[PDB]
Design an enzyme around this catalytic site. Structure first.
Site, short mmCIF file in Angstrom:
data_model
loop_
_atom_site.label_atom_id
_atom_site.label_comp_id
_atom_site.label_asym_id
_atom_site.label_seq_id
_atom_site.Cartn_x
_atom_site.Cartn_y
_atom_site.Cartn_z
CB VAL A 1 13.46 -1.26 1.34
CG1 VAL A 1 14.71 -1.88 0.85
CG2 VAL A 1 12.50 -1.94 1.80
N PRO B 1 13.70 -3.48 6.84
CG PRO B 1 14.19 -3.83 9.27
CD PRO B 1 14.33 -4.69 7.82
CG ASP C 1 9.62 2.95 5.85
OD1 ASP C 1 10.26 3.08 7.01
OD2 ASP C 1 9.75 2.00 5.18
CG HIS D 1 1.30 -5.73 -12.03
ND1 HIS D 1 1.42 -4.90 -10.78
CD2 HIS D 1 1.98 -6.69 -11.91
CE1 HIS D 1 2.20 -5.56 -10.33
NE2 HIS D 1 2.90 -6.39 -11.18
CG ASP E 1 -3.34 15.27 7.10
OD1 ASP E 1 -3.84 15.61 8.08
OD2 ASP E 1 -2.44 15.90 6.36
CG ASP F 1 5.43 -4.71 -11.93
OD1 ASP F 1 4.54 -5.76 -12.45
OD2 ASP F 1 4.78 -3.91 -11.04
CG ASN G 1 -2.39 -5.13 -2.22
OD1 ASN G 1 -2.02 -4.22 -1.74
ND2 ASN G 1 -2.24 -5.34 -3.44
CB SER H 1 0.60 -2.96 -6.75
OG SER H 1 1.72 -3.33 -7.92
CB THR I 1 -2.16 20.99 2.66
OG1 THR I 1 -2.66 22.05 1.85
CG2 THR I 1 -0.41 21.30 2.78
CA LIG Z 1 12.02 1.37 6.23
#
Ligand SMILES: [Ca+2]
Length: 279
Positions: free
Chosen positions: A177, A175, A200, A69, A260, A39, A161, A224, A16
Site C-alpha cells: 500500500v 509494503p 512511499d 476527524h 526538496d 475513519d 505520528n 492523517s 514545484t
Molecule cells: Ca508501498
C-alpha cells in the site's frame, strides 16, 4: 483551473516550490472516481461536499461523525474548497468511534467491506481508499490492507505520528500500500511524522485547513492529514487516465518533487506529492 488563496497544502501539491497560495488542477477534478474514507465517518450534509459524500457503512450505533476527524480527512480528499479532487465521490466507512478509537477486528472488517462494496458503486475512473489511522504492528491488519489493494483499490495509509520508523506500525508497514508521511509549509518533515524504508511518499500534514462537523472548518495536523492529499491526488490522476489503482503509488512517487524536504532521515524517501499540472 486555479483556486486562489487555497489552503497551503493544495497549493503545494500543484507547485514545484513552497510558498505559493494558488491551487492549479485539471477541471476534471476526479469526476468519475470514488474515494472511501475509512475513519470516524463523514458529515455528508456539510455544504462543502455538495451532495457528493455519503455514509455507506458503520460498525457503531450511528454512522454520524461525532468526532470530526473523518470529516476533515474527507474534506482534504474532495471538498469544494479544501479538497484535492473536487468532483470525486466520497464514501464514508465508520470503523472508528467518536473518540477516534477502533478495535483492529473492526478496522479489518471495514477494509474487506470496501473491497466488496466497490462492486456496488459507480467509479468508472477508479477507486481509492484513504486510511488515516493505525496502531502497533499487526500482520492481520497489514494483510487486510494488502487484500484491499489487491482487489483493485488504491490504498493510501498514514505513516503515523510517533516520529519513529513506520516499520513498527500497521497498516503503515504493509509494503503493497501507499504509506504517507507528513510535511510542513516550509518543506520540513513534520516534527511528528514517522519515517523509514516503508514510506512511499510525503504530503502536506502540518496545519491543514479542512471541513469539520457542525458544518464548520478547522486546521489540524497529522499524517492523517497528509494521507487524504495523496488519496485525492490518486483519484485526480486516475480520472485523467494517468495511472491505475495498482500503480498509482508508483506513479505518484515517480512524478513527485524530489529532494526538496528537510530533516528526512537517511534511508527514507525524499519525495513530495505533486500533480504535475501545467496550466
Ligand atoms: Ca508501498
Amino acid at each position: 483551473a486555479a483556486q486562489t488563496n487555497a489552503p497551503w497544502g493544495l497549493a503545494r501539491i500543484s507547485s514545484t516550490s513552497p510558498g505559493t497560495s494558488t491551487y492549479y488542477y485539471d477541471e476534471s477534478a476526479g469526476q468519475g472516481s470514488c474515494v472511501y474514507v475509512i475513519d470516524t465517518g463523514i458529515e455528508a450534509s456539510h455544504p462543502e461536499f455538495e451532495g457528493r459524500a455519503q455514509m455507506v457503512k458503520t460498525y457503531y450505533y450511528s454512522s454520524r461523525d461525532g468526532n470530526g476527524h473523518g470529516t476533515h480527512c474527507a474534506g482534504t480528499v474532495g471538498s469544494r474548497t479544501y479538497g484535492v479532487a473536487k468532483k470525486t465521490q466520497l464514501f464514508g466507512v465508520k470503523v472508528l468511534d467518536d473518540n477516534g478509537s477502533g478495535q483492529y477486528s473492526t478496522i479489518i472488517a471495514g477494509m474487506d467491506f470496501v473491497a466488496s462494496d466497490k462492486n456496488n458503486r459507480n467509479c468508472p475512473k477508479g477507486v481509492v481508499a484513504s486510511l488515516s489511522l493505525g496502531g502497533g504492528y499487526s500482520s492481520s491488519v497489514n494483510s487486510a490492507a494488502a487484500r484491499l489493494q489487491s482487489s483493485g483499490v488504491m490504498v493510501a495509509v498514514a505513516a503515523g505520528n510517533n516520529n519513529a520508523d513506520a516499520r513498527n506500525y500497521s497498516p503503515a508497514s504493509e509494503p503493497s500500500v501507499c504509506t504517507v508521511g507528513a510535511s510542513d509549509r516550509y518543506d520540513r518533515r513534520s516534527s511528528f511524522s514517522n519515517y523509514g524504508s516503508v514510506l512511499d511518499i510525503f504530503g502536506p500534514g502540518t496545519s491543514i485547513l479542512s471541513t469539520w462537523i457542525g458544518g464548520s472548518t478547522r486546521s489540524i495536523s497529522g499524517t492523517s492529514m497528509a494521507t487524504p492529499h495523496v488519496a485525492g491526488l490518486a483519484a485526480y490522476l486516475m480520472t485523467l487516465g494517468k495511472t491505475t489503482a495498482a500503480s498509482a503509488c508508483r506513479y505518484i512517487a515517480d512524478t513527485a518533487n524530489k529532494g526538496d524536504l528537510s530533516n528526512i532521515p537517511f534511508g527514507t524517501v525524499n519525495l513530495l506529492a505533486y500533480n504535475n499540472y501545467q496550466a
